[PDB]
Design a protein around this nucleic acid. Structure first.
Ligand SMILES: C[C@H](NC(=O)C(C)(F)F)[C@H](Oc1ccc2c(cnn2-c2cccc(C(=O)N[C@@H]3CCOC3)c2)c1)c1ccc2c(c1)OCCO2
Ligand SMILES: C[C@H](NC(=O)C(C)(F)F)[C@H](Oc1ccc2c(cnn2-c2cccc(C(=O)N[C@@H]3CCOC3)c2)c1)c1ccc2c(c1)OCCO2
Ligand SMILES: [Zn+2]
Ligand SMILES: [Zn+2]
Ligand SMILES: [Zn+2]
Ligand SMILES: [Zn+2]
Lengths: 326, 10, 323
DNA sequence: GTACAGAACATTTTGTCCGTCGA
DNA sequence: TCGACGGACAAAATGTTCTGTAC
């Protein structure tokens, strides 16, 4: 008797070749229902759930994604670079926000700056753990963090907001969530909308965890001094490694020759728009820092980076790296 | 020098 | 404001030691009695919220045990008129039996867009108090807001016919992800996509959309003022009050209503950058002698007459927030 | 005489309404 | 009187079988 054919989606015995792909009966009708049904399936995990006979009812967002990766229409104890990135991912920090007291723009922005300072501290220890960062010069390491701190904070905040609040709210910390009430507070709305674009794009693109981990490391290596770095030769091969790393994460995710490129296009196109997001986020942050009348509190760590950055952008000595235009 | 001291320490 | 310690849905009482909703009470009592092998598909940290509680039973059962569980109308309103005069949906006339092209798609959409632009003229000609304006203002307002009206109406159709994720241009021509990554297409779609995303994010009403689109027609004015500025200013604040009336018909809490007006008028403001960015690519394409995409005469006349107005700075874009 | 699409029935999993019973 | 338990009932989500139809 012939060896049982397997479902390219849930690994249960396949009933035939349905919708172009060797699929089972349960997977076939799930796919016809997802297309015609008009659903905005959300993932409780990180867009990389395991789809098998036992867990196919588990996630319809990842099962409907796996039907498109297999092609429907109408060992592993060898660490990889991204397995290290996952393990060195900073923990969730709490804002220390006293919810038993009424909100205010000052108290909210001060708390988030004081929190952002601690997030920065972790972002330094994270950078040290990235393979090859401490191989570069100290003046380069200091520069890379100074230049890309806002890309790392708005990217990690955008992903936390995507995952935790369906991409509707900003999830700064478990205790300080900028809700619809807090967003319409004075001087809040416009800055929050920039952070929300990051979350809204990660939502539209259904970014997977491995893809996110690679895009984040690539964001640290996205802004360079106009003339270059002390160890620029090394910087280039390090950045090139994580572009190949991103491409590896896109191969698992898409499972198709032509899909692999259309995907790389969008993620790298988002990585480009991150320079415009950070351009706008820093314009308001710098204006607030210099605004003596607002008098919002910035921590000793963050204030130091802000002062040593304001005349570097206004100098043009910042070569923003692009994947698509230049 | 506060950012440098965070990098220098092990 | 009672919230479920497991799924964050409105809790119904203190069930099995913890404040939970009715759905989690029976999930827990079921999961305990039925000796189950609940396997997690992620990293055993799945998010358990109202929308995703059905997803990971392994993580929901873990969250349950963590929380500490154990065993006569005849008078027409202004907005009722806008509902009647709202234009019908048109068909692109796209033959899907032939492979897609950037040229074929942009040209079909320009052709349909020209017809949608004619329907905007009949629609504006029927807005209460719009016909009352001077004719050289009725056509100035139509020319300034033409892309604002089309993007907002497209955004509403995309929001309504699915969610933010795609561009419902015509019942027969929808722009999916594989279509969006065609040459030159991505950047222009990105702006349209934003309009559907905000409409979705805000869960905008039809009565709210109707009012906002009328305010989008009355959003741009000449730098040297309109010939009927006394009347335009009066028509505009009538529709601003009308938008407020349509926000009243929703929730009804004073601060909720104020905040909703803040968010809605913030979107009406952002439409000026969305249209500025949509026009930069449109005008670039219109002049391009390599792409050769054909625009209908209806839209070519507007593009031609709008390029030097845009440069001269004779467009006073109105703002609700003036930040 | 096989092999699929879609409809029809069916099962599984999840959520609500309600009467009971103790306080 | 209120509030929680669980049973009874229901809705949502998933899965199988039957049928038509193209070879
Ligand atoms: C300096 C800014 N100040 C101003 O702009 C202003 C407004 F005060 F002027 C401050 O920025 C941020 C930006 C991200 C922030 C925080 C605080 N937590 N997170 C965060 C959340 C989740 C993960 C990570 C993260 O980086 N995690 C790991 C480390 C690297 O890897 C992963 C960081 C502060 C800000 C303050 C208040 C704001 C605001 C912006 O925008 C909206 C209105 O209120
Ligand atoms: C002029 C633009 N051309 C360029 O910018 C370009 C590409 F040539 F450069 C053209 O714009 C539009 C904009 C909206 C359009 C159309 C066609 N239908 N609708 C539409 C849908 C739903 C409702 C209404 C509407 O108005 N309905 C009622 C009537 C009045 O009241 C409400 C109108 C074309 C465009 C072309 C191709 C594009 C594109 C943009 O964006 C993405 C890439 O492909
Ligand atoms: Zn299957
Ligand atoms: Zn999933
Ligand atoms: Zn619950
Ligand atoms: Zn789980």
């Amino acid at each position: 008797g012939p060896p049982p054919k397997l479902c390219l989606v849930c690994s249960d015995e396949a009933s035939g070749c349905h919708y172009g792909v060797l699929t089972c009966g349960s997977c076939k009708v799930f796919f016809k229902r997802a297309v015609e049904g008009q659903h905005n399936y959300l993932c409780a995990g990180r867009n990389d759930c395991i789809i098998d006979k036992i867990r196919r009812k588990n996630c319809p967002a990842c099962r409907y994604r796996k039907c498109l990766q297999a092609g429907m229409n109408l060992p592993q104890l060898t660490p990889t670079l991204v397995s290290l990135l996952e393990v060195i991912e900073p923990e969730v920090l709490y804002a220390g926000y006293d919810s038993s007291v009424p909100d205010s723009t000052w108290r909210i922005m001060t708390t988030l700056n004081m929190l952002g300072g601690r997030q920065m501290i972790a972002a330094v220890k994270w950078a040290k753990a990235i393979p090859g960062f401490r191989n570069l010069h100290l003046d380069d390491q200091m520069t890379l963090l100074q230049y890309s701190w806002m890309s790392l904070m708005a990217f990690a905040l955008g992903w936390r907001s995507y995952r935790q609040s369906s991409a509707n709210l900003l999830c700064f910390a478990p205790d300080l969530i900028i809700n619809e009430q807090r967003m319409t507070l004075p001087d809040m709305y416009d800055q929050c909308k920039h952070m929300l674009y990051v979350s809204s794009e990660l939502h539209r693109l259904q970014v997977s965890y491995e893809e996110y981990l690679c895009m984040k490391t690539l964001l640290l290596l996205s802004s360079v001094p106009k003339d270059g770095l002390k160890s620029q030769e090394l910087f280039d091969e390090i950045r090139m490694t994580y572009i190949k790393e991103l491409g590896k994460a896109i191969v698992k995710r898409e499972g198709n020759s032509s899909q692999n490129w259309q995907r790389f296009y969008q993620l790298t196109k988002l990585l480009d728009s991150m320079h415009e997001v950070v351009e706008n986020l820093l314009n308001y942050c710098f204006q607030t820092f210099l605004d003596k009348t607002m008098s919002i509190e910035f921590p000793e760590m963050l204030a130091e980076i802000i002062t040593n950055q304001i005349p570097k952008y206004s100098n043009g000595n910042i070569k923003k790296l692009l994947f698509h235009q230049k | 020098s506060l950012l440098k001291k965070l990098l220098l320490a092990p």
